[PDB]
Amino acid sequence: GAHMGGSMKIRVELINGNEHRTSSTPQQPQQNPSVSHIFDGETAVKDHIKVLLTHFKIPVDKVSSYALQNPFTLAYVEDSFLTPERLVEAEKSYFILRMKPHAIADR
């Protein structure tokens, strides 16, 4: 059934053309790799991200540089935890999971 209400099964597009693995294609995706993932406000974002990464076959070590982004506003979730509001605004369409355009600091 539809997993909607509190926790949401939201389609996430993944961009990972930073690593050179695509559908053996160039950087023009018809669709991006997508998953309908269970998001909730009980699980930290990064943990949702470690899952997504893993489902997209990306090492969770990249969780650092990955963020959920809104498809319209292009706003990133830099939150540690998701809110119902984030989910709700996301169910409207999808979430995007991208490597954050930002310089990598030697943390």
UniProtKB/Swiss-Prot annotation:
Residues 15-36 are annotated as: Disordered. It is found in: Cytoplasm, Cytosol; Cytoplasm, Cytoskeleton. It comes from the Eukaryota. Disruption phenotype: Null cells grow normally during the vegetative phase and, when starved, migrate normally and form tight aggregates. Subsequently, however, null cells make aberrant fruiting bodies with short stalks and sori that remain unlifted. Aggregates are also unable to migrate as slugs, suggesting it is involved in mediating cell movement during multicellular stages of Dictyostelium development. Formins play an important role in the nucleation of actin and the formation of linear actin filaments. Belongs to the formin homology family. Diaphanous subfamily. The DAD domain regulates activation via by an autoinhibitory interaction with the GBD/FH3 domain. This autoinhibition is released upon competitive binding of an activated GTPase. The release of DAD allows the FH2 domain to then nucleate and elongate nonbranched actin filaments. Interacts (via GBD/FH3 domain) with activated Rho-GTPases. This is Formin-C. The chain holds residues 1 to 100 of 1158 of the full protein.
